Amino acid sequence: DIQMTQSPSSLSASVGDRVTITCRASRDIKSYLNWYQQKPGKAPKVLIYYATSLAEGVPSRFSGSGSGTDYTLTISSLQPEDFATYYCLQHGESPWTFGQGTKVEIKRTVAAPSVFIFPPSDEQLKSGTASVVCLLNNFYPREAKVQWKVDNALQSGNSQESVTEQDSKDSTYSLSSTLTLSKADYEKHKVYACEVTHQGLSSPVTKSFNRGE
Amino acid sequence: EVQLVESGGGLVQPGGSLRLSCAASGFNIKEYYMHWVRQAPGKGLEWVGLIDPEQGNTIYDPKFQDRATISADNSKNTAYLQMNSLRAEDTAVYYCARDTAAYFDYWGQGTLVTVSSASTKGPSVFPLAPSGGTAALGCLVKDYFPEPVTVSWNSGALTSGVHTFPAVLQSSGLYSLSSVVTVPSSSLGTQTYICNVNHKPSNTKVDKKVEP
């Protein structure tokens, strides 16, 4: 098949910056090359067709160039809403083939997370498990550290976390961490806390609650 | 108003078959090439094949030639994809797309097919209740299989401040996911927040009121 290699695989730039993404086909595709943009959880959306033509409805900051085996997608002034993964697609011959995708992230000013902690619900406690959740909201950069403490003792191996994709309007991230304990253990202890470290925080921030109170 | 609505997603056993539909409205599939494209979780786009609904001709990526069948029913204005002998590698979100020749201009919403020997399990939905000017509340959707689960707030009208996180696989092999929304502290006493959770694989729909 015709192999499509995009470069780079990921990049980050600031709002207003020019972004360049390239795509190389293993052999001549005679300009039958389209660029699609895909945001998290959505179907792809065409941007450029036949290497250089701008699709209807697409902002003029998007442009494509190239011929033969080499093609380039340019975004002249990156906008927050441009966060997405960009794919080239050759349709010069079957099978049609896609590049591997290039994820574009927005670079913005540091933003400290807002931190919140949630105890397990009474409804959940009717069973054998208790989940305690900690939310780190709207922060940047993506890197952040969360440590759990039960009765003031640091915890290991009993939590899991996940992070949202960059926000399309304010370019921040949010993170959720879940500490899992048995309902018996939860009912035994008192103080529950999550401690957060982040570039936008001079010292760790701790949010906590006492069971019962 | 062109629309492509897919169905047939869900859980399938290894070695079984997927059978997806792409129901078109607003145009006649007979006038376009209809294609199928898939995307395994966290990976790139992959072309599956196309059909010319006018006379039924099809072209498949050589990888699927022996196991996939693309077809169409003009009277129902629907295109279909069937793939047999499924394996783990076939777990993916499958999209149907309308091709103008120049480019794909309309896409189905996409439907996840999960190839696993595990059993379907519906989630339990628990409130994450609020404790300066901003507060947060949410819902914990726990112990379900397979993905996906959709969560909205106040029947989908509330999107401001909502963050629904990627599910995580737990030690049991079942998924857990949370959705939170940040709000004015003051609104906790002047209005009610409801998370709506839908898990199609187990036909589960839950509306959970989350109160302080």
Side-chain angles (χ1 to χ4, degrees), chain A residues 34 36 38 42-44 46 49 56 87 89 91 94-96 98 100 116 118 121 123-124 129 131 133 135 137-138 160-164 167 174-176, chain B residues 35 39 43-45 47 59 61-62 95 99 101-104 107-108 125-129 134 136-137 140 142 163 165-166 168-170 178 180 182 208:
Chain A
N34 296 359
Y36 291 88
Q38 180 187 37
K42 303 184 181 167
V46 63
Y49 65 93
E56 72 162 63
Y87 292 91
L89 165 71
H91 60 113
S94 305
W96 287 15
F98 289 92
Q100 83 276 12
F116 308 86
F118 306 96
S121 58
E123 163 170 38
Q124 177 180 34
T129 307
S131 298
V133 175
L135 170 69
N137 205 57
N138 299 345
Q160 288 186 297
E161 69 179 32
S162 93
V163 184
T164 60
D167 187 278
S174 290
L175 175 159
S176 177
Chain B
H35 297 228
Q39 181 163 46
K43 309 311 148 182
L45 294 172
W47 185 74
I59 305 172
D61 181 290
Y95 297 97
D99 170 25
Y103 57 83
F104 295 136
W107 296 72
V125 179
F126 303 119
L128 290 179
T134 300
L137 48 83
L140 177 66
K142 187 165 158 15
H163 289 299
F165 296 84
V168 292
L169 188 73
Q170 296 172 102
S178 57
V180 304
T182 52
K208 185 66 53 177

Side-chain angles (χ1 to χ4, degrees), chain A residues 70-81:
Chain A
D70 296 356
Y71 299 83
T72 302
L73 173 66
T74 298
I75 310 178
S76 59
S77 178
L78 188 72
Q79 295 296 306
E81 63 267 29

Side-chain angles (χ1 to χ4, degrees), chain A residues 89-158:
Chain A
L89 165 71
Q90 71 80 19
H91 60 113
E93 57 186 68
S94 305
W96 287 15
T97 45
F98 289 92
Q100 83 276 12
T102 293
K103 174 101 269 176
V104 166
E105 317 268 315
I106 298 334
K107 195 174 295 187
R108 56 150 295 163
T109 57
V110 174
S114 291
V115 187
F116 308 86
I117 188 172
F118 306 96
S121 58
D122 289 321
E123 163 170 38
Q124 177 180 34
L125 296 182
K126 288 194 206 321
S127 322
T129 307
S131 298
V132 188
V133 175
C134 181
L135 170 69
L136 277 64
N137 205 57
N138 299 345
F139 58 89
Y140 184 91
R142 197 175 181 283
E143 307 75 39
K145 171 188 183 189
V146 182
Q147 286 285 10
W148 281 99
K149 290 183 186 185
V150 178
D151 284 346
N152 207 14
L154 287 173
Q155 300 290 294
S156 295
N158 49 359

